[PDB]
A paper describes a structure:
The highly conserved [name] is critical for virus engagement of host cells. VRC01-class members, encoded by the immunoglobulin heavy chain gene segment IGHV1-2, include a five-residue light chain complementary-determining region 3 (CDRL3) and are characterized by high somatic hypermutation. To elucidate mechanisms of [name] recognition, we determined single-particle cryo-electron microscopy (cryo-EM) structures of a BG505SOSIP.664 trimer unbound (2.9 Å) and in complex with representative Fabs from each expanded B cell clone: 04_A06 (3.8 Å), 01_D03 (3.2 Å) and 05_B08 (3.3 Å).
Our 04_A06 complex structure also included [name]. Its 34-residue CDRH3 is inserted down the trimer symmetry axis and contacts protein residues and the gp120 N160 N-glycan of all three protomers, resulting in a well-resolved glycan density for the core pentasaccharide of each N160 glycan and additional glycans in some cases. Mass spectrometry analysis reported that the gp120 N160 glycan is underprocessed, containing a mixture of high-mannose, hybrid and complex-type N-glycans. In our structure, density was not observed for a core fucose, a component of complex-type N-glycans, nor could clear density be discerned much beyond the core pentasaccharide, the latter a likely consequence of limited resolution, glycan compositional heterogeneity and/or glycan flexibility. The ability to accommodate and/or interact with the three gp120 N160 glycans on an [name] trimer, whether or not processed beyond high-mannose carbohydrates, likely contributed to the enhanced breadth and potency of [name]. Our structure recapitulates key molecular interactions between [name] and [name] recently reported, such as the interaction between gp120 K169 and heavy chain Tys100F, electrostatic interactions between an Asp-Asp-Asp motif at the tip of the [name] CDRH3 with gp120 R166 of all three protomers and extensive glycan density at gp120 N160 on all protomers.
Numbering used by the authors:
A (entry chain M): 2 to 91, 96 to 108
B (entry chain I): 2 to 35, 35A, 35B, 35C, 35D, 35E, 35F, 35G, ...
C (entry chain E): 33 to 58, 65 to 134, 136 to 138, 147 to 184, 188 to 306, 309 to 321, 321A, 322 to 397, ...
D (entry chain F), E (entry chain D), F (entry chain B): 520 to 546, 566 to 663
G (entry chain C): 193 to 245
H (entry chain A): 148 to 184, 188 to 192
């Protein structure tokens, strides 16, 4: 199965909200996971099963489905969040990833 | 679960490399029914990240009976095993190419029925570099 | 104007957790069937018309409960058995002697020292050990489990054969059986009938293939969780059995030696006659027919254009990469590579080499390890291959060929096939309804 | 018929075969099988007793079907009698009124206690 | 007298001392004695519950002697009433009708169910 | 209110809210906790069943409040009715009757049985 | 020692008494014990003097 | 000065994995956990 993730990159201020989405080519229920990686650091889990929150992270992160369109919303951006984001489903991984950075 | 990986490795093309991922005090799980410790059903995945590229899933090992499953692209050259006595997992990559250099991560999966392919704990990462 | 009335014994049920008890039909067996309540000669079986109920083989708790059960009986049968710690001694082993080229180096003639019935003396005792049970430190070897876990010998009077056991819910609970012959894993089952309790369930112990067990009715069926999920396994259920004959063509005499006061240990005596290799046979034509039926029923979830290839396991422990099972109180690990070689595209028998192990650690327990005692005489068993535990292999989007391989290990997947058509439910005999009456 | 025979049937048939499916609500060392069987038997007895005590509170003990003194508030359900008793199965009705069960049970309990008190006071004459 | 005192007596004598012997129907670690005692206690409770439920289904719960509405088919026993009530003992009478016992239970259950349905229908108006 | 809510209250308040505590009379390996809990549950069921036995033998099954047909012998308590029902809580009443329970219990059952017999002899006509 | 070549001899605890203390066997509720009061009662057969307990 | 003899470095000859050869093995014990008979302690 193929996963298409958008946008390739985006930029935002401090405290604003952003959204990052990806579409999977099939029906996968809610089996989508969200990963963030700071530069030079090992990626850690934030959203599992596309609507649950991993322990030990802020509650400003959210994720949801609309049909087969999975999205992640960020509110009140704190600029430690600069890094990369990926969505995984099953064995496939989203190519490239989406990099978020301050203005 | 705290995950300790191996060190940075440099290997010439055509050789073989091995990366060790240790997850202490986490292979065994209590079974309150029988009241004894059984080897868990957890999974250990192996991912790689090329310089400036998204992660790629190599394969994973269910450590119960050591069952494995590899990505078909790497099939025939990657072996994945586990040692329950020392609570570690070994990746053995054979006949590396110039593009094989990357940061290799070992990841832990609780293998819960509801959430599929959830990798919670991640190793510090290893630098596998191939050059002539 | 309306009023409320209560009704007792109203046909309402809700899915719920519940402890179930065994019940068999009337020798100490590793499954304590002698403690099972005897079953009635004619189990009650009631059809249910116009009844549609959801089913979920994967969320079923019956499989988990019965797995916990089987574990409990297995441990309990080992508690009153002879401890085998004094075996962890240095073994002076030599190679064994009228042996074919296949079994070269797979049998070791090991002599060593044992504590006798008394203690001031020790005895020199020789025995035969399979190569998979010993590891080098004539040469000095030691048992495979000496630096990890302890060894307890199964008492050589417990029949390891799977005697069918019916799981039965207590009063106030019911079992619903899905009579729909075309029923996949989950979903509604229009043809559902209640029963007092389950049919004959054989707790057959196997990893790669399903032995004996229960067949389908109409045609071979492929049941699984998300077939998109490479991780999730693929249960297969055949419409006709594949008769497999597995045997160990060695005489394999047994020698009972004494290692402690009262406690005795049974070792492998010198084999009388030629030492061949234990093997299994399956009919080539029948196997080809079964595989063709499987691929035809399997193309439905992937498309006719897709190619399907069966390959031997990709690796793991001896008990998963090979076909591991139990026959006549002995353990077999069969190579089974010759059983997966097809490349399906839109009288002869298939011999399978097998190896024998005695240090068994099924359901890996930190600290325990069964030592299977040797069995006198040549041993042979005919079984029905009924299902396969297949696993997919994740492939590229451009690639159009899917590769299936045998899997297993997780015995819950093995056991779900025998309980896929059963659901435990709780009867709620209390209801309220509006009528026009008014109590005086 | 038999146990749960009228499960798919409408109200009319089910409301006449209560006894056949109420008859089977109730039918040695410390081995795993033994302890499982003992716990199962005790659980069945406990469930039966809970149901019987609930029946006894509403003053309908010993009766398969009994009439009561509180009316059917349309808030619980607005469906008319005819289609209720000739159109839907028991399971559907239970799923329709499941989330309203506690308050109606309390209503029956209070009404039965009040009726008993009033009957005692009247009998005091 | 006391428990089982008049067992060998006549129907006439025994049929008036039901209570004295019906009253006595209900009257640690995991050792052998403990598990045996627990099993015995739960078995006695289960047996009594079975009997009480069998009383309840025929609408006689809480009644020592209840009257029914099912005719006595003479095929079971054609003996005269006075004969069986003035000469026999209860054991002999039970032995005589042992094989005719499930049928009468079924007839009683159906009769009580029909009577209850008729009572509800009458109480509707 | 709640469980045992009117425990200290007077006769009248308690005699109006019995069912709040009547409904709360009824609510795995072989480890210490398992056997302890199993014994607790079996004992609770047995106690409730003995209570049900005593209630059923008095012909008041399923009734929180039932009346009898035996005189209140003044030898037990010859006190004015109004002061009993307006002064003393149930606890003190029990502490003043506890010596005299068994006899009255027996009287009850006997009367009940006799009554039943008489009723049967009336209904045979 | 005699049984060491076939058995697993275990020592009885010192303070536990072997003396047979009289015990009573009681049936649970809903059961009775019928005792033959007759003093001439041979092996089997009817006992005309039965007492419950 | 508060650990004068409190901790004892005790070595013994516990058997190795296989029950035939002895291996010298050291450990630390608290003085309240040993009794005298370097010296010999049990
Ligand atoms: C699927 O089901 C079939 C049908 O039951 C089953 O085949 C059976 O396998 C067992 C396994 O050995 C066979 O049992 C043997 O039968 C021979 C002939 O009667 C006996 O001589 C053997 O006796 C040995 O075992 C005894 C156990 O107490 C010892 O006391 C004795 O000394 C011998 O050592 C042994 O009982 C059996 O004959 C067949 N057939 C039938 C009809 O049972 C097959 O094994 C099943 N598939 C599995 C389990 O994978
Ligand atoms: C119990 O003893 C056994 C046997 O001694 C131990 O298994 C052995 O563990 C060693 C650990 O170094 C393995 O050596 C390794 O071999 C691989 C090749 O497979 C090699 O590439 C490595 O560099 C390393 O040398 C050895 O293979 C292995 N043998 C077997 C049969 O398992 C086991 O670890 C011990 N368990 C303990 C100490 O808890
Ligand atoms: C494994 O090796 C042992 C060690 O020999 C074999 O056990 C038996 O050992 C005894 C004494 O060592 C042998 O006795 C001698 O046999 C020779 C030839 O038969 C005879 O000339 C002597 O007088 C003496 O009796 C005995 O032979 C040997 N057993 C056999 C069957 O030869 C054991 O057999 C070996 N295991 C095998 C070969 O599978
Ligand atoms: C454990 O030790 C006892 C004591 O020696 C063994 O019992 C003895 O067994 C031997 C051989 O089985 C018997 O010898 C025979 O004696 C008869 C006379 O009764 C003689 O005619 C025969 O030629 C033969 O020598 C011996 O009688 C017997 N003793 C008793 C008291 O029964 C027992 O077999 C041993 N158990 C083992 C080794 O498992
Ligand atoms: C794939 O697997 C997921 C595992 O959760 C299935 O998703 C569940 O489906 C059931 C329907 O039986 C729903 O009740 C759950 O809410 C779903 N949960 C989640 C997390 O998705 C899904 O149905 C399977 N099939 C497909 C095509 O996705
Ligand atoms: C098993 O059969 C049931 C019954 O049709 C399937 O349930 C429906 O299947 C269709 C076609 O796949 C879907 O469009 C529906 O959405 C399913 N129902 C629900 C409630 O989701 C079920 O999918 C079948 N299982 C498999 C693995 O094919
Ligand atoms: C396997 O070994 C046993 C034991 O020797 C053989 O059984 C003996 O066979 C011979 C003749 O072949 C008889 O004289 C003996 O009476 C048999 N019993 C014993 C105890 O010796 C058996 O024939 C061998 N082969 C098999 C079972 O195929
Ligand atoms: C499995 O099949 C093989 C080959 O068809 C059998 O091996 C032959 O067995 C016969 C009889 O035992 C011997 O005479 C032959 O020498 C064996 N080899 C060959 C090449 O024919 C084997 O016996 C079969 N085993 C079972 C259990 O069916
Ligand atoms: C496995 O064993 C069975 C039973 O011994 C064999 O079935 C026999 O096969 C021969 C030749 O095909 C027939 O003549 C017999 O009538 C069969 N007997 C029975 C009882 O079925 C079978 O051939 C063996 N091999 C395989 C691969 O099944
Ligand atoms: C599955 O079949 C393949 C067939 O190639 C086996 O691969 C060979 O196994 C032998 C066994 O020693 C090795 O010597 C070869 O080097 C292997 N070939 C390759 C390309 O790796 C494989 O072992 C089989 N798997 C099993 C039996 O579990
Ligand atoms: C399982 O069986 C296969 C095939 O019988 C074995 O693969 C053979 O391995 C040898 C030695 O490496 C090669 O010479 C053969 O060419 C291989 N055959 C095939 C078809 O590839 C394999 O080694 C066996 N594995 C085990 C563990 O027994
Ligand atoms: C293997 O499969 C065959 C299929 O025929 C089984 O034989 C049937 O068994 C069922 C139940 O025991 C009977 O109702 C049928 O009458 C049998 N048919 C025939 C033709 O025998 C057999 O029991 C299975 N198990 C084995 C052989 O161990
Ligand atoms: C405890 O005792 C007091 C006084 O003895 C009770 O108070 C009575 O409350 C009722 C309810 O309004 C009044 O009608 C009475 O007049 C009060 N008593 C007096 C003497 O005035 C009280 O109800 C008792 N119970 C509790 C739970 O407090
Ligand atoms: C089954 O038989 C057909 C007949 O030609 C053959 O093409 C196919 O390869 C066979 N499959 C096997 C032997 O797995
Ligand atoms: C099933 O529904 C049909 C609807 O026409 C009805 O006639 C039939 O009686 C129902 N089945 C049962 C067993 O009542
Ligand atoms: C026993 O038989 C005698 C004989 O008349 C009778 O008087 C008596 O009532 C019977 N029953 C008892 C309990 O004695």
């Amino acid at each position: 199965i193929q996963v298409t993730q958008s946008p390739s990159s985006l930029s935002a201020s401090i405290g604003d909200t952003i959204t990052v989405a990806c579409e999977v080519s099939q029906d996968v229920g809610w089996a989508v996971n969200w990963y963030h990686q700071r530069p030079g650091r090992p990626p850690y889990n934030l959203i599992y099963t596309a609507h649950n929150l991993a322990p030990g992270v802020a509650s400003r992160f959210r994720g949801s489905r609309v049909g087969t369109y999975f999205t992640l919303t960020i509110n009140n951006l704190l600029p430690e969040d600069v890094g990369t984001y990926y969505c995984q489903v099953f064995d496939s991984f989203a190519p490239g990833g989406t990099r978020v950075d301050l203005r | 679960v705290r995950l300790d990986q191996s060190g940075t490795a440099v290997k010439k093309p055509g050789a073989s490399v091995r990366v060790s991922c240790r997850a202490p005090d986490s292979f065994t799980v209590y079974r309150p029914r029988l009241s004894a410790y059984f080897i868990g059903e957890f999974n250990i995945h192996w991912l790689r990240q090329a310089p400036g590229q998204g992660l790629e899933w190599l394969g994973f090992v269910n450590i119960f009976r050591g069952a494995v499953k590899y990505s078909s692209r790497f099939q025939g050259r990657i072996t994945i095993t586990r040692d329950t006595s020392s609570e570690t997992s070994y990746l053995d990559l054979g006949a590396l190419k110039a593009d094989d250099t990357a940061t290799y991560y070992c990841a832990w999966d609780k293998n819960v029925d509801d959430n599929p392919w959830r990798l919670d704990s991640w190793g510090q990462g290893t630098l596998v570099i191939v050059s002539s | 104007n309306l009023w409320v009335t209560v009704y007792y014994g109203v046909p309402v049920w809700k899915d719920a957790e519940t402890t179930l008890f065994c019940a068999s039909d009337a020798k100490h067996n590793v499954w304590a069937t002698h403690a099972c309540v005897p079953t009635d000669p004619n189990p009650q079986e009631i059809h249910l018309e116009n009844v549609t109920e959801e089913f979920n083989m994967w969320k079923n708790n019956m499989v988990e409960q019965m797995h916990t059960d089987i574990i409990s009986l297995w441990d309990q049968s080992l508690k009153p058995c002879v401890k085998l710690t004094p075996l962890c001694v240095t073994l002076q082993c030599t190679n064994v002697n009228n042996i074919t080229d296949d079994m070269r180096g797979e049998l070791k003639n090991c002599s060593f020292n044992m504590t006798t019935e008394l203690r001031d003396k020790k005895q020199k005792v020789y025995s035969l050990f399979y190569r998979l049970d010993v590891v080098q430190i004539n040469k000095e070897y030691r048992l495979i489990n000496c630096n990890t876990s302890a060894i307890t010998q199964a008492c050589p009077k417990v029949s390891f054969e799977p005697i069918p056991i019916h799981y039965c819910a207590p009063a106030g609970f019911a079992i619903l059986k899905c009579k729909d012959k075309k029923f996949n894993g989950t979903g509604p089952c229009p043809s559902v009938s209640t029963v007092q309790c389950t049919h004959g369930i054989k707790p057959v112990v196997s990893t790669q293939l399903l032995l004996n067990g229960s067949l389908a009715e109409e045609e071979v069926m492929i049941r699984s969780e998300n077939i998109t999920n490479n991780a999730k396994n693929i249960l297969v259920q055949f419409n006709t059995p594949v008769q497999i004959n597995c045997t160990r063509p060695n005489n394999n005499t047994r020698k009972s030696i004494r290692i402690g006061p009262g406690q005795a240990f049974y070792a492998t005596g010198d084999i009388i006659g030629d030492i061949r290799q234990a093997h299994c046979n399956v009919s080539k034509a029948t196997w080809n027919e079964t595989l063709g039926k499987v691929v035809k029923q399997l193309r439905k979830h992937f498309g006719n254009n897709t190619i399907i290839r069966f390959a031997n396991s990709s690796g793991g422990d001896l008990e998963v990469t090979t076909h591991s099972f139990n026959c006549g109180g002995e353990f077999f690990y069969c190579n089974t590579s010759g059983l997966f070689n097809s490349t399906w595209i839109s009288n002869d028998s298939i011999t399978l080499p097998c190896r024998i192990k005695q240090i068994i650690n099924m359901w890996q327990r930190i600290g325990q390890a069964m030592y299977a005692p040797p069995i006198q005489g040549v041993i042979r068993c005919v079984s029905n291959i009924t299902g396969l535990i297949l696993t997919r292999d994740g492939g590229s989007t451009n690639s159009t060929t899917e590769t299936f391989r045998p899997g297993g290990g997780d015995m819950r997947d093995n056991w779900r096939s025998e309980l896929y058509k059963y659901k435990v439910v709780k009867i709620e005999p209390l209801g309220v309804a509006p009528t026009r009456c008014k109590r005086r | 018929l038999g146990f749960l025979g009228a499960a798919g049937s409408t109200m009319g048939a089910a409301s006449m075969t209560l006894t056949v499916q109420a008859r089977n609500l109730l039918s040695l060392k410390l081995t795993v099988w033994g302890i499982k069987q003992l716990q199962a038997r005790v659980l069945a007895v406990e469930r039966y007793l809970r149901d019987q005590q609930l029946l006894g509170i509403w003053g309908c003990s010993g009766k398969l079907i009994c009439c009561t003194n509180v009316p059917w508030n349309s808030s619980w359900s607005n469906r008319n009698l005819s289609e209720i008793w000739d159109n839907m199965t028991w399971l559907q009705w239970d799923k329709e009124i499941s989330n309203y069960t506690q308050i109606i049970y309390g209503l029956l309990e209070e009404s039965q206690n009040q009726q008993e008190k009033n009957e005692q006071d009247l009998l005091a004459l």
